[PDB]
Every structure is written in structure tokens, then in C-alpha cells.
Amino acid sequence: AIGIGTLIIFIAMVLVAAVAAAVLINTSGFLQQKAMATGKESTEQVASGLLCS
Amino acid sequence: AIGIGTLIIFIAMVLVAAVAAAVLINTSGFLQQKAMATGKESTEQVASGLLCS
Numbered sequence A, B: 001a002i003g004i005g006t007l008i009i010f011i012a013m014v015l016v017a018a019v020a021a022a023v024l025i026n027t028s029g030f031l032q033q034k035a036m037a038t039g040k041e042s043t044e045q046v047a048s049g050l051l052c053s
Helices: A002-047 B002-047
Strands: none
Touching: A002 B002
16 A cells, blocks of 8 residues: 555656756756856957057 | 755855845946046146246
């Protein structure tokens, strides 16, 4: 009798951990973009310019 | 079971990094003002004067 239930709730544990992992993976992806963008943009700003002759 | 908690503490990590960033951004702002002011003022002082004829 006991055995049956153990299996069922095990399934839930798996899925819930999976769902949480998805958040972390996805979010890391979302940030990767902006992180790079910010650095490149900021460098081009400080480095570039024109000079009156 | 484990999944649930991971999500919650993730939220905190975000907010704490945000709060710290705010300090750095703000502070940079606060300094920007005085930095410029000091330079302009100091130049006007050294350059200006009157001369007896």
C-alpha cells in the first residue's frame, strides 16, 4: 500500500526541480545579452571622438 | 520540495545586487557635480587678476 504513493510523489519532486532549473537557465540567458551589450557600448563611447584642427 | 526554495532565495540575490548597484550609480552622480565645479573654479582663480598701470 505504502509503496504506491512513494512513487507518485517522487514524480512531483522531479518536475518541480525541473521547473525551478528552467528559471535559472533561462534567466541566465536573458542576462547574457544585456551584459555583453552594455560593455561594448560603453567602451565605444569612451574611446571615440573628433578633434578640431 | 527543494525546487521551491531555490526560486525564493534567487529573488533575494537579485534585489540585494540591485540595492548595491544603486549605491555605486548614485555616488558617482554625487561626485560628478563637485568634480567639475572644482576644476572650473580653480582655473578661473589662477587665470584672472588686475594690474596697476
